[PDB]
């Protein structure tokens, strides 16, 4: 019942 | 060239759990694609025109942890499997694809950029079949035109015997209708 969390990212080139 | 990608992890197990409970994420946000996690699942989100879009089957009705506290979904469409939150500051916002190329790419959570042939509005074929285990956790990941503009987000895999030959996606068109409706 918590929030969704950003745990990482993807950088596009 | 061609389109390439890499991933950077920003949080560990413990921090993710705590941020989940507080709804507060003070971390710097960057990149076109966010790797998201809930208590039980991980998946992707793509930022397009200032909204971070993902699948309902990952996010449900949940808020997104943010710098000012939990962010409420601005768009929720259950049957279309689509949700969106206003993109936190720092996410790189993608441009929807115009030209209408049928030569696509799917970007996975592993930051691979894989060739897809668009077969219809919401469908594309993986030019090389992949194991379903490889695609798992990539929902919400972008399908891109050759220019790098976004055609939609990964929704579901068509698979048999553990191998996926094709993917269903949510077209940027469905995002605008969802925005127009609400
Ligand atoms: C065509 O429209 C669809 C298709 C599938 C949907 C859905 O699928 C549910 C959820 C969805 C799914 O797993 N998506 C994926 C995924 O990675 N999910 S995930 O990230 O691991 C997750 C878990 C945390 C979210 C992309 C697939 C990766 C590999 C997963 C491989 C193994 C499962 C195959 C299955 N394929 C299909 O269901 C399928 C293939 C062809 N058709 C017509 N349906 C499938 O992809 N899914 C079942 C859930 C859902 O939930 C909403 C109703 C809220 N809505 C869907 C809708 C609308
Ligand atoms: Na890569």
mmCIF file of C-alpha atoms and ligand atoms in Angstrom:
data_model
loop_
_atom_site.group_PDB
_atom_site.id
_atom_site.type_symbol
_atom_site.label_atom_id
_atom_site.label_comp_id
_atom_site.label_asym_id
_atom_site.label_seq_id
_atom_site.Cartn_x
_atom_site.Cartn_y
_atom_site.Cartn_z
ATOM 1 C CA UNK A 1 0.000 0.000 0.000
ATOM 2 C CA UNK A 2 3.030 2.230 -0.329
ATOM 3 C CA UNK A 3 4.160 4.490 -3.131
ATOM 4 C CA UNK A 4 5.872 3.354 -6.287
ATOM 5 C CA UNK A 5 9.565 4.224 -6.028
ATOM 6 C CA UNK A 6 12.148 5.191 -8.655
ATOM 7 C CA UNK A 7 15.021 2.769 -8.062
ATOM 8 C CA UNK A 8 17.022 3.514 -11.234
ATOM 9 C CA UNK A 9 16.956 5.003 -14.700
ATOM 10 C CA UNK A 10 17.881 4.344 -18.286
ATOM 11 C CA UNK A 11 19.562 7.013 -20.378
ATOM 12 C CA UNK A 12 18.993 6.914 -24.128
ATOM 13 C CA UNK A 13 21.500 7.909 -26.821
ATOM 14 C CA UNK B 1 24.608 5.184 -33.717
ATOM 15 C CA UNK B 2 22.268 3.316 -33.611
ATOM 16 C CA UNK B 3 20.086 4.132 -30.610
ATOM 17 C CA UNK B 4 21.824 2.884 -27.466
ATOM 18 C CA UNK B 5 20.974 2.925 -23.765
ATOM 19 C CA UNK B 6 22.491 2.352 -20.386
ATOM 20 C CA UNK B 7 21.070 2.011 -16.884
ATOM 21 C CA UNK B 8 22.130 3.535 -13.561
ATOM 22 C CA UNK B 9 20.793 2.181 -10.254
ATOM 23 C CA UNK B 10 19.784 4.898 -7.754
ATOM 24 C CA UNK B 11 18.443 2.999 -4.702
ATOM 25 C CA UNK B 12 18.951 -0.219 -2.832
ATOM 26 C CA UNK B 13 16.568 -2.617 -1.156
ATOM 27 C CA UNK B 14 16.374 -0.746 2.158
ATOM 28 C CA UNK B 15 15.982 2.745 0.708
ATOM 29 C CA UNK B 16 13.285 1.574 -1.670
ATOM 30 C CA UNK B 17 11.257 0.098 1.184
ATOM 31 C CA UNK B 18 11.540 3.244 3.296
ATOM 32 C CA UNK B 19 10.761 5.583 0.394
ATOM 33 C CA UNK B 20 7.741 3.389 -0.315
ATOM 34 C CA UNK B 21 6.409 4.088 3.185
ATOM 35 C CA UNK B 22 7.279 7.787 3.369
ATOM 36 C CA UNK B 23 6.257 8.754 -0.167
ATOM 37 C CA UNK B 24 9.227 11.126 -0.100
ATOM 38 C CA UNK B 25 12.005 10.791 -2.699
ATOM 39 C CA UNK B 26 14.688 13.480 -2.471
ATOM 40 C CA UNK B 27 16.885 11.773 -5.085
ATOM 41 C CA UNK B 28 17.872 13.596 -8.262
ATOM 42 C CA UNK B 29 15.860 12.268 -11.223
ATOM 43 C CA UNK B 30 17.389 11.903 -14.702
ATOM 44 C CA UNK B 31 16.876 9.936 -17.912
ATOM 45 C CA UNK B 32 13.967 9.237 -20.275
ATOM 46 C CA UNK B 33 13.058 5.931 -18.632
ATOM 47 C CA UNK B 34 12.569 5.342 -14.914
ATOM 48 C CA UNK B 35 13.029 1.972 -13.292
ATOM 49 C CA UNK B 36 10.182 1.637 -10.779
ATOM 50 C CA UNK B 37 9.576 -0.692 -7.908
ATOM 51 C CA UNK B 38 6.787 -1.456 -5.497
ATOM 52 C CA UNK B 39 7.000 -3.739 -2.489
ATOM 53 C CA UNK B 40 6.534 -6.766 -4.740
ATOM 54 C CA UNK B 41 7.302 -5.831 -8.392
ATOM 55 C CA UNK B 42 9.663 -3.916 -10.657
ATOM 56 C CA UNK B 43 8.912 -2.416 -14.046
ATOM 57 C CA UNK B 44 9.498 0.664 -16.182
ATOM 58 C CA UNK B 45 8.045 4.072 -16.862
ATOM 59 C CA UNK B 46 8.518 6.350 -19.827
ATOM 60 C CA UNK B 47 8.250 10.120 -19.663
ATOM 61 C CA UNK B 48 6.391 11.676 -22.574
ATOM 62 C CA UNK B 49 5.231 15.277 -22.763
ATOM 63 C CA UNK B 50 5.796 15.877 -19.054
ATOM 64 C CA UNK B 51 4.015 12.755 -17.789
ATOM 65 C CA UNK B 52 5.640 9.560 -16.517
ATOM 66 C CA UNK B 53 3.629 6.749 -18.040
ATOM 67 C CA UNK B 54 3.515 3.148 -16.982
ATOM 68 C CA UNK B 55 1.282 0.078 -16.762
ATOM 69 C CA UNK B 56 -1.619 -0.289 -14.345
ATOM 70 C CA UNK B 57 -0.653 -3.930 -13.825
ATOM 71 C CA UNK B 58 2.581 -2.686 -12.284
ATOM 72 C CA UNK B 59 1.553 0.510 -10.526
ATOM 73 C CA UNK B 60 -2.104 -0.089 -9.730
ATOM 74 C CA UNK B 61 -3.611 3.052 -8.182
ATOM 75 C CA UNK B 62 -0.419 3.941 -6.301
ATOM 76 C CA UNK B 63 1.195 7.323 -5.784
ATOM 77 C CA UNK B 64 4.742 7.920 -6.972
ATOM 78 C CA UNK B 65 7.307 8.958 -4.333
ATOM 79 C CA UNK B 66 8.484 12.518 -5.059
ATOM 80 C CA UNK B 67 10.479 15.506 -3.706
ATOM 81 C CA UNK B 68 7.368 17.132 -2.209
ATOM 82 C CA UNK B 69 5.835 13.835 -1.065
ATOM 83 C CA UNK B 70 3.642 11.250 -2.899
ATOM 84 C CA UNK B 71 2.400 12.242 -6.367
ATOM 85 C CA UNK B 72 -1.163 11.373 -7.284
ATOM 86 C CA UNK B 73 -1.812 9.733 -10.630
ATOM 87 C CA UNK B 74 -3.050 12.344 -13.085
ATOM 88 C CA UNK B 75 -4.332 9.678 -15.471
ATOM 89 C CA UNK B 76 -5.669 6.226 -14.638
ATOM 90 C CA UNK B 77 -7.155 3.913 -17.215
ATOM 91 C CA UNK B 78 -7.519 0.392 -15.926
ATOM 92 C CA UNK B 79 -8.876 -1.375 -19.017
ATOM 93 C CA UNK B 80 -6.194 0.171 -21.195
ATOM 94 C CA UNK B 81 -3.558 -0.804 -18.559
ATOM 95 C CA UNK B 82 -2.255 2.769 -18.463
ATOM 96 C CA UNK B 83 -1.394 5.175 -15.673
ATOM 97 C CA UNK B 84 0.494 8.404 -15.503
ATOM 98 C CA UNK B 85 1.906 10.854 -12.981
ATOM 99 C CA UNK B 86 3.179 14.362 -13.647
ATOM 100 C CA UNK B 87 6.857 13.729 -14.343
ATOM 101 C CA UNK B 88 9.066 14.660 -11.405
ATOM 102 C CA UNK B 89 11.535 17.462 -12.094
ATOM 103 C CA UNK B 90 14.633 16.134 -13.835
ATOM 104 C CA UNK B 91 13.183 13.338 -15.985
ATOM 105 C CA UNK B 92 14.038 13.748 -19.675
ATOM 106 C CA UNK B 93 10.749 14.070 -21.568
ATOM 107 C CA UNK B 94 10.431 12.150 -24.848
ATOM 108 C CA UNK B 95 8.794 13.291 -28.094
ATOM 109 C CA UNK B 96 5.973 11.174 -29.609
ATOM 110 C CA UNK B 97 6.768 9.658 -32.991
ATOM 111 C CA UNK B 98 5.234 11.434 -36.004
ATOM 112 C CA UNK B 99 6.738 10.104 -39.232
ATOM 113 C CA UNK B 100 5.083 6.706 -38.829
ATOM 114 C CA UNK B 101 7.995 4.346 -39.380
ATOM 115 C CA UNK B 102 7.177 0.666 -38.799
ATOM 116 C CA UNK B 103 10.790 -0.050 -37.883
ATOM 117 C CA UNK B 104 10.815 0.109 -34.107
ATOM 118 C CA UNK B 105 12.951 -0.712 -31.080
ATOM 119 C CA UNK B 106 11.975 -1.895 -27.628
ATOM 120 C CA UNK B 107 14.152 -0.680 -24.759
ATOM 121 C CA UNK B 108 14.248 -3.217 -21.903
ATOM 122 C CA UNK B 109 15.059 -2.743 -18.169
ATOM 123 C CA UNK B 110 18.425 -4.254 -19.021
ATOM 124 C CA UNK B 111 18.945 -1.240 -21.275
ATOM 125 C CA UNK B 112 19.056 -3.325 -24.427
ATOM 126 C CA UNK B 113 17.606 -1.720 -27.533
ATOM 127 C CA UNK B 114 15.940 -4.512 -29.550
ATOM 128 C CA UNK B 115 14.554 -4.366 -33.129
ATOM 129 C CA UNK B 116 10.788 -4.647 -33.448
ATOM 130 C CA UNK B 117 8.659 -4.601 -36.613
ATOM 131 C CA UNK B 118 5.339 -2.776 -36.069
ATOM 132 C CA UNK B 119 2.538 -5.072 -37.242
ATOM 133 C CA UNK B 120 -0.449 -2.857 -36.424
ATOM 134 C CA UNK B 121 -1.453 -0.012 -34.131
ATOM 135 C CA UNK B 122 -0.763 -1.800 -30.831
ATOM 136 C CA UNK B 123 1.408 -4.763 -31.960
ATOM 137 C CA UNK B 124 4.988 -5.445 -33.068
ATOM 138 C CA UNK B 125 7.058 -8.527 -33.759
ATOM 139 C CA UNK B 126 10.400 -9.183 -32.121
ATOM 140 C CA UNK B 127 12.695 -9.723 -35.087
ATOM 141 C CA UNK B 128 14.679 -12.105 -32.922
ATOM 142 C CA UNK B 129 12.540 -14.057 -30.465
ATOM 143 C CA UNK B 130 13.464 -13.621 -26.794
ATOM 144 C CA UNK B 131 12.904 -15.736 -23.684
ATOM 145 C CA UNK B 132 10.007 -14.379 -21.617
ATOM 146 C CA UNK B 133 12.364 -14.206 -18.613
ATOM 147 C CA UNK B 134 14.369 -11.622 -20.520
ATOM 148 C CA UNK B 135 11.368 -9.338 -21.152
ATOM 149 C CA UNK B 136 9.877 -9.673 -17.643
ATOM 150 C CA UNK B 137 9.984 -6.399 -15.697
ATOM 151 C CA UNK B 138 10.128 -4.337 -18.895
ATOM 152 C CA UNK B 139 6.482 -3.277 -19.043
ATOM 153 C CA UNK B 140 6.221 0.492 -19.299
ATOM 154 C CA UNK B 141 9.423 0.577 -21.358
ATOM 155 C CA UNK B 142 9.349 2.666 -24.552
ATOM 156 C CA UNK B 143 8.974 1.515 -28.119
ATOM 157 C CA UNK B 144 10.945 3.956 -30.262
ATOM 158 C CA UNK B 145 10.997 5.065 -33.890
ATOM 159 C CA UNK B 146 14.417 5.101 -35.644
ATOM 160 C CA UNK B 147 14.797 8.782 -34.724
ATOM 161 C CA UNK B 148 14.466 7.894 -31.048
ATOM 162 C CA UNK B 149 10.960 9.304 -30.665
ATOM 163 C CA UNK B 150 8.422 7.229 -28.729
ATOM 164 C CA UNK B 151 5.573 5.253 -30.350
ATOM 165 C CA UNK B 152 4.172 3.755 -27.161
ATOM 166 C CA UNK B 153 4.995 1.661 -24.098
ATOM 167 C CA UNK B 154 5.493 -2.099 -23.634
ATOM 168 C CA UNK B 155 2.300 -3.680 -22.242
ATOM 169 C CA UNK B 156 2.383 -7.435 -22.790
ATOM 170 C CA UNK B 157 4.307 -10.251 -24.473
ATOM 171 C CA UNK B 158 2.885 -12.843 -26.844
ATOM 172 C CA UNK B 159 4.651 -16.000 -25.816
ATOM 173 C CA UNK B 160 4.606 -19.757 -26.186
ATOM 174 C CA UNK B 161 6.762 -22.327 -24.434
ATOM 175 C CA UNK B 162 8.634 -19.514 -22.686
ATOM 176 C CA UNK B 163 9.564 -17.652 -25.862
ATOM 177 C CA UNK B 164 8.097 -14.294 -26.935
ATOM 178 C CA UNK B 165 7.702 -13.661 -30.680
ATOM 179 C CA UNK B 166 5.860 -10.344 -30.415
ATOM 180 C CA UNK B 167 4.815 -7.526 -28.093
ATOM 181 C CA UNK B 168 1.632 -5.551 -27.451
ATOM 182 C CA UNK B 169 2.048 -1.896 -26.580
ATOM 183 C CA UNK B 170 0.049 1.182 -25.635
ATOM 184 C CA UNK B 171 0.367 3.745 -28.499
ATOM 185 C CA UNK B 172 1.073 7.416 -27.758
ATOM 186 C CA UNK B 173 -2.356 7.890 -29.385
ATOM 187 C CA UNK B 174 -3.955 6.102 -26.428
ATOM 188 C CA UNK B 175 -2.182 8.536 -24.113
ATOM 189 C CA UNK B 176 -3.750 11.588 -25.755
ATOM 190 C CA UNK B 177 -7.236 10.050 -25.793
ATOM 191 C CA UNK B 178 -6.756 9.244 -22.086
ATOM 192 C CA UNK B 179 -5.694 12.862 -21.528
ATOM 193 C CA UNK B 180 -8.514 14.230 -23.703
ATOM 194 C CA UNK B 181 -11.101 12.133 -21.846
ATOM 195 C CA UNK B 182 -10.034 13.173 -18.347
HETATM 196 C C1 LIG C 1 -4.120 -6.467 -25.036
HETATM 197 O O1 LIG C 1 -4.443 -5.784 -23.849
HETATM 198 C C2 LIG C 1 -3.898 -6.262 -22.643
HETATM 199 C C3 LIG C 1 -3.001 -7.318 -22.661
HETATM 200 C C4 LIG C 1 -2.452 -7.802 -21.467
HETATM 201 C C5 LIG C 1 -2.811 -7.220 -20.232
HETATM 202 C C6 LIG C 1 -2.243 -7.737 -18.997
HETATM 203 O O2 LIG C 1 -1.329 -8.823 -19.077
HETATM 204 C C7 LIG C 1 -0.697 -9.292 -17.911
HETATM 205 C C8 LIG C 1 0.485 -8.471 -17.537
HETATM 206 C C9 LIG C 1 1.345 -8.647 -18.755
HETATM 207 C C10 LIG C 1 2.801 -8.655 -18.597
HETATM 208 O O3 LIG C 1 3.387 -9.534 -17.984
HETATM 209 N N1 LIG C 1 3.606 -7.611 -19.241
HETATM 210 C C11 LIG C 1 5.041 -7.721 -19.183
HETATM 211 C C12 LIG C 1 5.886 -7.408 -17.980
HETATM 212 O O4 LIG C 1 7.109 -7.312 -18.013
HETATM 213 N N2 LIG C 1 5.159 -7.210 -16.752
HETATM 214 S S1 LIG C 1 6.061 -6.895 -15.418
HETATM 215 O O5 LIG C 1 6.901 -5.713 -15.582
HETATM 216 O O6 LIG C 1 6.962 -7.997 -15.150
HETATM 217 C C13 LIG C 1 4.939 -6.758 -14.016
HETATM 218 C C14 LIG C 1 4.055 -7.949 -13.879
HETATM 219 C C15 LIG C 1 5.369 -5.948 -12.841
HETATM 220 C C16 LIG C 1 4.456 -5.354 -13.875
HETATM 221 C C17 LIG C 1 5.625 -7.180 -20.446
HETATM 222 C C18 LIG C 1 5.555 -8.662 -20.217
HETATM 223 C C19 LIG C 1 6.859 -9.240 -19.892
HETATM 224 C C20 LIG C 1 6.988 -10.623 -19.884
HETATM 225 C C21 LIG C 1 5.779 -11.493 -19.452
HETATM 226 C C22 LIG C 1 5.572 -12.823 -20.110
HETATM 227 C C23 LIG C 1 4.539 -13.776 -19.497
HETATM 228 C C24 LIG C 1 3.084 -13.283 -19.447
HETATM 229 C C25 LIG C 1 2.475 -12.987 -20.772
HETATM 230 C C26 LIG C 1 1.285 -12.032 -20.831
HETATM 231 N N3 LIG C 1 0.809 -11.888 -22.183
HETATM 232 C C27 LIG C 1 -0.560 -11.557 -22.366
HETATM 233 O O7 LIG C 1 -1.252 -11.423 -21.383
HETATM 234 C C28 LIG C 1 -1.156 -11.401 -23.738
HETATM 235 C C29 LIG C 1 -0.546 -11.674 -24.959
HETATM 236 C C30 LIG C 1 -1.467 -11.401 -25.963
HETATM 237 N N4 LIG C 1 -2.611 -10.978 -25.368
HETATM 238 C C31 LIG C 1 -3.837 -10.585 -26.042
HETATM 239 N N5 LIG C 1 -2.437 -10.981 -24.004
HETATM 240 C C32 LIG C 1 1.656 -10.649 -20.370
HETATM 241 O O8 LIG C 1 2.555 -10.031 -20.964
HETATM 242 N N6 LIG C 1 0.993 -9.991 -19.235
HETATM 243 C C33 LIG C 1 -0.086 -10.515 -18.373
HETATM 244 C C34 LIG C 1 -2.629 -7.117 -17.772
HETATM 245 C C35 LIG C 1 -3.542 -6.052 -17.819
HETATM 246 O O9 LIG C 1 -3.961 -5.432 -16.619
HETATM 247 C C36 LIG C 1 -4.910 -4.411 -16.745
HETATM 248 C C37 LIG C 1 -6.255 -4.944 -17.178
HETATM 249 C C38 LIG C 1 -4.966 -3.493 -15.485
HETATM 250 N N7 LIG C 1 -4.051 -5.600 -18.990
HETATM 251 C C39 LIG C 1 -3.687 -6.179 -20.216
HETATM 252 C C40 LIG C 1 -4.256 -5.684 -21.442
HETATM 253 C C41 LIG C 1 -5.205 -4.574 -21.438
HETATM 254 NA NA1 LIG C 2 22.756 -1.120 -23.525
#
